[PDB]
Design a protein around this ligand. Structure first.
Ligand SMILES: Nc1nc2ccccc2[nH]1
Ligand SMILES: [Ca+2]
Length: 223
């Protein structure tokens, strides 16, 4: 997260860190047994870390749970990043409490101008490398379709939205992939891709979660 602020311990109780000997991607808890993340975050042998603040210190509220099953969306295209969403089932149910909580799925799509909260443990430098140990937060608006497609000609599908600032300086970045974009208490997006981080006229690109609710609900119910 570039140009954001320190969230504060367990303020984003739905935020998950995916670990495979180290933190590699963010995720969102949608229920006591399931996590939503980005398909580009797929890896074998994932450990789901809940209730985390500092990813390098055991602070007392963490739940470490192995993944039992991983499901990448059937139409995921690694080349275009179209349909960048995957579902992760936990070996055992997480205990929901004040610090570990689930985020609900949208009943409808958010419109441009809606303010959202983007969170993660990714790079904090525009051009440099500095990884935080604590969860970073960023309030950002959904941008208009037209300004998104203007920034990335022929790359934006109906399954993606842009969020951030065209002036640059504040965006998501490497390490935040698969992380949540929450607008008016519902998971509206997943950190997917972009061109560099916080560059002018190059905002973040997010998977448009409202397009996958049916797929998510049906998949979870049958697994
Ligand atoms: N804005 C932005 N967000 C990103 C997330 C992962 C990789 C590159 C990125 N650029
Ligand atoms: Ca910790």
């Amino acid at each position: 997260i570039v140009g954001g602020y320190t969230c504060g311990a367990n303020t984003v109780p739905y935020q998950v860190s995916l670990n495979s000997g180290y933190h590699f991607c963010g995720g969102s808890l949608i229920n006591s047994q399931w996590v939503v993340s980005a398909a580009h975050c797929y890896k074998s042998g994932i450990q789901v870390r809940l209730g985390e603040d500092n990813i390098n210190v055991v602070e007392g509220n963490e739940q470490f749970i192995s993944a039992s099953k991983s499901i990448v969306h059937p139409s995921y295209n690694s080349n275009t990043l179209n349909n960048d969403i995957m579902l992760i089932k936990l070996k055992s149910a997480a205990s929901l409490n004040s610090r570990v909580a689930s985020i609900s799925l949208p009943t409808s799509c958010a419109s441009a101008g809606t303010q959202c909260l983007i969170s993660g443990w990714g790079n904090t430098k525009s051009s440099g490398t500095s990884y935080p140990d604590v969860l970073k937060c960023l309030k950002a608006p959904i941008l208009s379709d037209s300004s998104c497609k203007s920034a990335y000609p022929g790359q934006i599908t109906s399954n993606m939205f842009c969020a951030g600032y065209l002036e640059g300086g504040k965006d998501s970045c490497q390490g935040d992939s698969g992380g949540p974009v929450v607008c008016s208490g519902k998971l509206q997006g997943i950190v997917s891709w972009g061109s560099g981080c916080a560059q002018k006229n190059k905002p973040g690109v997010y998977t448009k979660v409202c397009n996958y609710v049916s797929w998510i609900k049906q998949t979870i119910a049958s697994n």
